[PDB]
Amino acid sequence: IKDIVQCFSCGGCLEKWQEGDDPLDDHTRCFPNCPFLQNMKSSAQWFQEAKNLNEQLRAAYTSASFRHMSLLDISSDLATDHLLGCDLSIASKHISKPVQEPLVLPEVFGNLNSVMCVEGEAGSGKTVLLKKIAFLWASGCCPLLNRFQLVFYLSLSSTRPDEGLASIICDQLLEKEGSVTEMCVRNIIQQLKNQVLFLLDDYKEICSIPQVIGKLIQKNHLSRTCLLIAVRTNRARDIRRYLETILEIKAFPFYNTVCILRKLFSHNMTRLRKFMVYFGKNQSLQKIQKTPLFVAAICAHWFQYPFDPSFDDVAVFKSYMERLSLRNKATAEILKATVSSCGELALKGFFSCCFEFNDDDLAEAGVDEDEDLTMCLMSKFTAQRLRPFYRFLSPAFQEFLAGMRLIELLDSDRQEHQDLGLYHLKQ
Amino acid sequence: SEGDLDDLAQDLKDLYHTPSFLNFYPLGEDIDIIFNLKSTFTEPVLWRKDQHHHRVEQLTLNGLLQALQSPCIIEGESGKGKSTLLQRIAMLWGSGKCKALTKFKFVFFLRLSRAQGGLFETLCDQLLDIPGTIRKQTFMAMLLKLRQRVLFLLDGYNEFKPQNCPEIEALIKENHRFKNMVIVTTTTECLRHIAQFGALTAEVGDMTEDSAQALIREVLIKELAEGLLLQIQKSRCLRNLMKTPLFVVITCAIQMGESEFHSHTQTTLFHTFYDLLIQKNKHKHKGVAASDFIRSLDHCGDLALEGVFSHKFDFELQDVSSVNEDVLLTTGLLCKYTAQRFKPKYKFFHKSFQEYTAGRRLSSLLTSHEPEEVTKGNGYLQKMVSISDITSTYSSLLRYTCGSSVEATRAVMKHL
Numbered sequence A: 001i002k003d004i005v006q007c008f009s010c011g012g013c014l015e016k017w018q019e020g021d022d023p024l025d026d027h028t029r030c031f032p033n034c035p036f037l038q039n040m041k042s043s044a045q046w047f048q049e050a051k052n053l054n055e056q057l058r059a060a061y062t063s064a065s066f067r068h069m070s071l072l073d074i075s076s077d078l079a080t081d082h083l084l085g086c087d088l089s090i091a092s093k094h095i096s097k098p099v100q101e102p103l104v105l106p107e108v109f110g111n112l113n114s115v116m117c118v119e120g121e122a123g124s125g126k127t128v129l130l131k132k133i134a135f136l137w138a139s140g141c142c143p144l145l146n147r148f149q150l151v152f153y154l155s156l157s158s159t160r161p162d163e164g165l166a167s168i169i170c171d172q173l174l175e176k177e178g179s180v181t182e183m184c185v186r187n188i189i190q191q192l193k194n195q196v197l198f199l200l201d202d203y204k205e206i207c208s209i210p211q212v213i214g215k216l217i218q219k220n221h222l223s224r225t226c227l228l229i230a231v232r233t234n235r236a237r238d239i240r241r242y243l244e245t246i247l248e249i250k251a252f253p254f255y256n257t258v259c260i261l262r263k264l265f266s267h268n269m270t271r272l273r274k275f276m277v278y279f280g281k282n283q284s285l286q287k288i289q290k291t292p293l294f295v296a297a298i299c300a301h302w303f304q305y306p307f308d309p310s311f312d313d314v315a316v317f318k319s320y321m322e323r324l325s326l327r328n329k330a331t332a333e334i335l336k337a338t339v340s341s342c343g344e345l346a347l348k349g350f351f352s353c354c355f356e357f358n359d360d361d362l363a364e365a366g367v368d369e370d371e372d373l374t375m376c377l378m379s380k381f382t383a384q385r386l387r388p389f390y391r392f393l394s395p396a397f398q399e400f401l402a403g404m405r406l407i408e409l410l411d412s413d414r415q416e417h418q419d420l421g422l423y424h425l426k427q
Numbered sequence B: 001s002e003g004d005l006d007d008l009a010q011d012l013k014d015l016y017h018t019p020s021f022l023n024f025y026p027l028g029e030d031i032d033i034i035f036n037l038k039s040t041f042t043e044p045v046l047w048r049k050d051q052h053h054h055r056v057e058q059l060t061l062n063g064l065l066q067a068l069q070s071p072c073i074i075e076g077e078s079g080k081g082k083s084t085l086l087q088r089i090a091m092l093w094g095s096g097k098c099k100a101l102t103k104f105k106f107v108f109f110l111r112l113s114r115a116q117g118g119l120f121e122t123l124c125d126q127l128l129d130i131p132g133t134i135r136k137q138t139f140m141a142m143l144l145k146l147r148q149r150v151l152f153l154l155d156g157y158n159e160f161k162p163q164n165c166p167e168i169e170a171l172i173k174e175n176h177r178f179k180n181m182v183i184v185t186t187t188t189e190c191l192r193h194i195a196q197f198g199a200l201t202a203e204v205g206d207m208t209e210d211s212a213q214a215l216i217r218e219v220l221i222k223e224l225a226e227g228l229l230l231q232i233q234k235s236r237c238l239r240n241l242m243k244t245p246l247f248v249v250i251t252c253a254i255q256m257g258e259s260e261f262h263s264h265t266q267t268t269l270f271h272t273f274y275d276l277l278i279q280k281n282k283h284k285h286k287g288v289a290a291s292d293f294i295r296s297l298d299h300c301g302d303l304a305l306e307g308v309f310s311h312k313f314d315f316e317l318q319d320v321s322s323v324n325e326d327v328l329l330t331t332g333l334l335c336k337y338t339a340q341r342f343k344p345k346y347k348f349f350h351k352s353f354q355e356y357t358a359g360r361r362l363s364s365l366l367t368s369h370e371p372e373e374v375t376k377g378n379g380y381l382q383k384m385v386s387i388s389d390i391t392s393t394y395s396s397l398l399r400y401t402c403g404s405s406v407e408a409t410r411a412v413m414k415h416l
Ligand SMILES: Nc1ncnc2c1ncn2[C@@H]1O[C@H](COP(=O)(O)OP(=O)(O)OP(=O)(O)O)[C@@H](O)[C@H]1O
Pocket: A070, A071, A072, A073, A083, A084, A086, A087, A121, A122, A123, A124, A125, A126, A127, A128, A129, A202, A260, A292, A293, A296
């Protein structure tokens, strides 16, 4: 950012960089408590082509356009570099036997081999995770990943199933349609093999993929290129056949929520303090902040009323479904329709104490399980089971949706869809 | 080119260790349950069959892989478990664990159900992306020493039509062009070809008690595995039914993802089995009108019900004579035999399955809104007037009849 000089050990500061000053005295004067300062006071044709590609990739990943990964949608400014200290809860599940074990990142990076997959609910943070890995590699200050010579972060969001690798990396990773050719890239991949890693985001189906990439999944024994694919649990039926184990993202821990809020704010301690107490007594409501996207919903609200010393426990839900309209919107007939149909499902479920639905219960509600919006509210589970099921994001959210639907029924002027509100109210 | 032969041998060995060759679907591709061939069905029971007259005791793997003969055929029934055996052989060669297969330099696992054009095309697209250094039509010329070094494993013969790839039929028929080892998996309908070659015939039998237990413990959370393995000790019917793979992978599939053990009742185990049996083939069933499909199944129902009253379980071809015999066989409700000891006739999956089928049909008659169907239903119950027979011959039928419907139960209890 223009002239913002940040300290790794305390956050963004020194705005407008006072001219002619001394950074050691300015740092000390502004933050006379920083541990860093306290310590200070106390104290071969393909080969050459591959090298040129490597340098370009590193430059792309460490650039201030790949860093500051739009975390929590704070801004294009207001550096968020100090917010990249929170990780996700990862577990490894077997596709065959009912076995699950917890992991930490140092034990994941050391087990990257052939084809691996990261599964989770919408907004779980799987896209940030893949970018973080590419960033660590490019930096070079993370031994264990330094064995890879080429790392490609690509998004299979609209790429046609006929595009070659050169035509993809030159579009998403490199500045211009140059540096590499299709033959150059293929020659490199078959020489490095184990030292090449692809990070493939936004995966949908095996059919709608570049042929050149699909061949690295289906027959990955003649190449041994390492692939890491991130998918939603609403899919993840297409690639299980090629896996041994799956990395699953678990609920985002409450203590990470606290840290993020503490770092971004702290200017209003009387609000943060109330937050801590509220979720201390209401032990089950800690499950509301299951997905990082809900944390973003809080931050977005807390930045609008920075000096209002009160915690509104439903603000996160009102915010969450407001920001939902700014992702991929279609207010008419889509956003309203998906919320309404999902709301009906939730409303019925909350008077039978279900909190779990099958396909027939879903179908009668008029919910389209293949819609994109009905994945930011609800998740599908197709794990090793005779029959699949659906569940809403953290149950407190279901009650919120049920509440919303009840109001719509009571306010509507259609008798056929209005007396129903009284039917439910009288329960 | 020895360099290419060595790379080919290495690629095959490594291919057979990949998850893409080990992740197996025991129920179908629709139901996302995956078993690992390395830990699942491991110990098959094979018999050496001579002229349909069984003849000799069990021949296990390794043993059967030492006592190899000119091209051999291994057969199943109407479709129980799947052809996991051929995959197991390829795995054993790739690992090198079994010395019986150590003499082989190449093992090729093929699916004839997805093969066309020719041998080189099939191997290239189906198995390995074989390079142009091999695909010059010179491969077989140098390979020819393969007579005693190469094994071909062919699945899905019954799904393959010779017109799709004359080379496959020409080779499986003649064989002497390479004089290599060939093992092909077929069904009972293929007895029409088996007896024409003089080939050693291997029959796939049932499961051992240990095999069924192993699957329950290996692919089911402990708490449910312990419950299920107790229920099986209480019910004699389960101990016998659990010998058949389709009643092993289902009786545990229904509890996958559950947190608590339930006994269910052996009416819903058959119900689940039945529903899957008539659904997994719903695409190929399109060859028969939906209304005709229903009629075919209803006919089978009536046959089972009449069979119970007539004390018969074996239905001669002329007893069924329904034209839609192919539909029932496609479905898998009946097993067809054409053997000398089994002249054209049909049998049910299991004796107790015929009884279930009869029960399902009787209840659907009794609960029908059409008085003709209700009359037929009552006509069957009316025959049951004898305490000594009700508690014996018709005990099973009544249990299934009631289990499938409350309204059917009303009719039964009023009668009894
Ligand atoms: N470590 C983190 N700290 C703070 N916020 C995070 C973190 N990781 C992820 N997020 C939030 O996660 C959101 C992205 O979520 P996710 O990675 O699941 O993508 P998505 O919304 O499912 O869509 P796609 O999978 O197409 O990217 C970002 O808006 C970001 O604010």
